[PDB]
Amino acid sequence: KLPPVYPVTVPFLGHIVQFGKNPLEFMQRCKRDLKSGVFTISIGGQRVTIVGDPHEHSRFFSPRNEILSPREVYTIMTPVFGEGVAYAAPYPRMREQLNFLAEELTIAKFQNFVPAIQHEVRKFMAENWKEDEGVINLLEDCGAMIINTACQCLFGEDLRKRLNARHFAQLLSKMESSLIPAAVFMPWLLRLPLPQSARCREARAELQKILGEIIVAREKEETSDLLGGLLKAVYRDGTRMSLHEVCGMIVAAMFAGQHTSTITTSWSMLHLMHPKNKKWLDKLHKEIDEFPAQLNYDNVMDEMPFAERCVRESIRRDPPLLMVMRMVKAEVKVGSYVVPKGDIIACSPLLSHHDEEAFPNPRLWDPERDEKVDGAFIGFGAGVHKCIGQKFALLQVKTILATAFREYDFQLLRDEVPDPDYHTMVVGPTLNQCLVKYTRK
Numbered sequence: 001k002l003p004p005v006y007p008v009t010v011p012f013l014g015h016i017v018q019f020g021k022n023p024l025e026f027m028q029r030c031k032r033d034l035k036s037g038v039f040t041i042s043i044g045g046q047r048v049t050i051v052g053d054p055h056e057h058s059r060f061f062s063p064r065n066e067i068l069s070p071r072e073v074y075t076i077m078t079p080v081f082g083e084g085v086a087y088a089a090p091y092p093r094m095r096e097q098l099n100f101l102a103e104e105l106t107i108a109k110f111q112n113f114v115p116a117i118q119h120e121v122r123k124f125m126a127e128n129w130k131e132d133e134g135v136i137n138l139l140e141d142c143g144a145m146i147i148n149t150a151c152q153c154l155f156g157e158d159l160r161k162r163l164n165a166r167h168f169a170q171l172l173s174k175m176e177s178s179l180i181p182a183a184v185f186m187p188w189l190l191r192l193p194l195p196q197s198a199r200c201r202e203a204r205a206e207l208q209k210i211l212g213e214i215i216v217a218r219e220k221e222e223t224s225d226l227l228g229g230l231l232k233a234v235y236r237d238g239t240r241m242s243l244h245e246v247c248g249m250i251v252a253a254m255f256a257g258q259h260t261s262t263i264t265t266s267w268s269m270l271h272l273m274h275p276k277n278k279k280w281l282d283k284l285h286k287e288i289d290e291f292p293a294q295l296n297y298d299n300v301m302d303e304m305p306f307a308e309r310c311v312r313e314s315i316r317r318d319p320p321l322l323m324v325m326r327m328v329k330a331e332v333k334v335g336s337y338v339v340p341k342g343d344i345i346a347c348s349p350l351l352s353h354h355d356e357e358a359f360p361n362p363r364l365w366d367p368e369r370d371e372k373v374d375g376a377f378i379g380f381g382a383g384v385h386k387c388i389g390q391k392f393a394l395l396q397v398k399t400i401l402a403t404a405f406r407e408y409d410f411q412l413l414r415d416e417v418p419d420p421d422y423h424t425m426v427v428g429p430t431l432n433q434c435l436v437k438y439t440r441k
């Protein structure tokens, strides 16, 4: 039982085009006009099957790569993380590799983090929000704090000194400068692509070059950072990581967070400041108002369940990553239908999070809601490939919120909360809507 196919009106580009303008509405359209939402868009002549049903998510996450591999679809990353580094490494290694990062971003590895990140914020604002009140772009400053903060946590002083955040940021940016989201048909498209790499690849090298130097430098003198920790790692056979792979994993760490976290932090501030949500804002404050000026792990990790709620909804309502794809290397059965081998198969947070059965009044941002279908919230993916940085991210967000709101109040210079800008790789509030006003308490 092949799933319905939205008929293709213009031979080569219509869906890719139609999705670009309004994917949510587009996708829903197929759900709507084919009745049963396990449809199959065609993108480039690639049959693409979207699993639109919360109930049948489980089928999307669970099958192991040898049945549903992202290695094929995410190939575009390969210049960035490095040849053989991640999805470009056979699954024993990839799994091994990913597993090592995860172990660096575990809640154990956070003992000292909160003040570090809490610092950078108090530092940043003070430096960029001098006046009692002023006007700033929110997206950007969240963007600056996110990056800034991560570095404070995940990188050592020598290292931080040798390559400061701003430079990283530019470094990182050059790397997406490469990226082209063909992922839906992306794999095949790789014929002789222009060195979109050329800009980035240089960037990877410069990072690596640096990374070596600290290692060389550090060892001379006589250490627990992200770099330090990855080096200690050993594969199951018993080989260590090659700084090439080390450099890649670090890139992954900075890469995943940069937009998703920024967008998340931002939305969350955006919704909380808005006047509709006074109620929620007051709730937060009771939560955070007795927190000691100095902030420590426990306040954030343990004593902030609501705030977490707020972040999760923000992601739930407008998730940064619109969808997830796997390459079907074997025929598999989703509910009634069956999906061909060789059909790229995708699952979308953006859609499932607006299925009205599981998220009714999806556009209402309620931090206190709870999914009415399990695994409907997939903002951080699910099953095998669960996000491995989410705990870290949340940590970042919840701290920025407590710190910012605690000493500031914000006024949204737009009548309504912004509109999502879908014209980006990772989807966020529109940069222009984001103007926002701040008043030192």
Ligand code: HEM
Pocket (backbone or CB within 6 Å): 070, 098, 101, 252, 253, 254, 256, 257, 260, 261, 262, 264, 315, 320, 321, 324, 325, 378, 379, 380, 381, 382, 384, 385, 386, 387, 388, 389, 390, 392, 393
């Ligand atoms: C707001 C922040 C974030 C959001 C919303 C987010 C969301 C997600 C989602 C939905 C997935 C599943 C993608 C898929 O199944 O292909 C995922 C996977 C992943 N995320 Fe994140 N993520 C975030 C932050 C991070 C950070 C900071 C890291 C840092 C390393 C990270 C690393 C990963 C990795 C490695 C995977 C892949 C799991 C695998 O391939 O097995 N993420 N993330």
Ligand SMILES: O=C(N[C@H](Cc1c[nH]c2ccccc12)C(=O)Nc1ccncc1)c1ccc(-c2cccc(F)c2)cc1F
Pocket (backbone or CB within 6 Å): 074, 077, 181, 182, 183, 184, 252, 255, 256, 257, 260, 321, 322, 323, 387, 425, 426
């Ligand atoms: O920007 C993207 N991907 C980036 C880099 C990245 C790719 N594979 C990863 C696996 C782990 C970590 C990072 C990445 C990333 O950072 N993703 C990420 C994933 C998990 N956690 C954190 C971050 C990206 C965004 C959108 C689309 C897209 C959406 C809808 C339709 C469509 F056709 C394309 C595709 C994208 F490739």
